[PDB]
């Protein structure tokens, strides 16, 4: 309830055109080798804009992590619906821009995907 991992796994497919989920051993949990967006393994509770390998983070994303933004379900669900709007508010700035060019419409899928991330993307 309030999040379905199995439905989240299916909804996460649309994210694979840009993201991947690869643990620290090199094993792929989900993905087709997409590199447009950062590796989402270990994102749960991680400070926005700090995945060690991703070199394409925007300034808004990085200044939100600097202001102490750490991914949880609340902020996660808000961000995926509109990356730009989300980053403008949080950051306080107005001309802050997000580089993720995608929007998840249904808020339900937001919770389902987050439940999927806690099930397979949490770095112990």
């Amino acid at each position: 309830q309030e999040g379905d991992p199995e439905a989240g796994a299916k909804a996460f497919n649309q994210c694979q055109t840009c993201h991947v989920i690869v643990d620290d051993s090199g094993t792929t949990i989900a993905g087709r080798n997409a590199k447009t967006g950062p590796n989402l393994y270990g994102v749960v509770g991680r400070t926005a804009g700090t995945q060690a390998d991703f070199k394409g983070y925007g300034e808004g994303m990085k200044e939100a992590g600097a202001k102490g933004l750490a991914w949880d379900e609340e902020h996660f669900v808000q961000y995926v619906q509109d990356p730009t709007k989300f980053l403008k508010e949080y950051t306080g700035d107005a001309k802050a821009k997000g580089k993720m060019t995608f929007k998840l419409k249904k808020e339900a899928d937001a919770h389902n995907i987050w439940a999927y991330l806690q099930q397979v993307a949490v770095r112990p």
């Binding site: 649309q14 694979q16 087709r32």
Partner: protein, 267 residues
């Protein structure tokens, strides 16, 4: 009575006849442009300087999903969009009818109407047929320069990357094909214009050396060729298949297939 129709039937714009269907179409076409401009000026705060700098960023969005296929949404929340779609629906269809009766009036085949109908097919799937099968107007396309592009980008990502939709792939082959085909043909006819080649109707009724050299050029090149008439039969099919195959490809997105990449890995 007939006098009124006859009166409209003689409607013109210079030497070109407009007819009844033409007047209904241009009128219907204005209301559409008026509904979008009225909403755009509003978004611009009635400020002409703002209207020009943000022209491409304005967008008349469709009713929210919570409204399904109802006509309840208020003007500023989907009402306008619905009105604009109505008017556009009539403008296009009236113009289609005008093209059918005009061909009939000049005593020609209906080939133009049929080809136009294929274009209308894709349009009908994007803004009417598909949204109705999905259950909500929110699925339709917004009226805006940059917004309908953002819409196109999002539609693909949401459905698993349209590059894996075979009908999108066929549609593309035909789009490139249309360009590959008009270049060859346009270039073939210009290469033999020195022999009156561009007078295609006469080359059909009475083949000349221009038509023969066009054929031999390709027969010697790729091993096969066409006739002055048949070449235009390849042309019309090459072009209408662009919107036929793709309409099918979008009509299948979200209603039968949710993720094309996955579908593709299975087939």
């Amino acid at each position: 009575f007939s006098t009124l129709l006859g009166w409209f039937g003689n409607a013109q714009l210079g030497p070109i006849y407009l007819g009844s269907l033409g007047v209904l179409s241009l009128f219907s076409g204005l209301m559409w442009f008026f509904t979008i401009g009225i909403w755009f000026w509003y978004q611009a705060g009635w400020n002409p300087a703002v209207f020009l700098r943000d022209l491409f960023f304005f967008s008349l969005e469709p009713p929210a999903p919570e409204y399904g296929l109802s006509f309840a949404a208020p003007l500023k929340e989907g009402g306008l969009w619905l009105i604009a779609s109505f008017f556009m629906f009539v403008a296009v269809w009236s113009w289609w009818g005008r093209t059918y009766l005009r061909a009939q009036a000049l005593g020609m085949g209906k080939h133009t109407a049929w080809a136009f109908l294929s274009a209308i097919w894709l349009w009908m799937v994007l803004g009417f047929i598909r949204p109705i099968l999905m259950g909500s107007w929110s699925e339709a396309v917004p009226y805006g320069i940059f917004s309908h592009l953002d819409w196109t980008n999002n539609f693909s990502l949401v459905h698993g990357n349209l590059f894996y939709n075979p009908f999108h792939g066929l549609s593309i082959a035909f789009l490139y094909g249309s360009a590959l085909l008009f270049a060859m043909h346009g270039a073939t006819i210009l290469a033999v214009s020195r022999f009156g080649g561009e007078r295609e109707l006469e080359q059909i009724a009475d083949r000349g050396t221009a038509a023969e050299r066009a054929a031999l050029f390709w027969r010697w090149t790729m091993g096969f060729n066409a006739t002055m008439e048949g070449i235009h039969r390849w042309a019309i099919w090459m072009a209408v298949l662009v919107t036929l195959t793709g309409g099918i490809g979008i009509l299948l997105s979200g209603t039968v297939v949710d993720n094309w990449y996955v579908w593709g890995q299975n087939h």
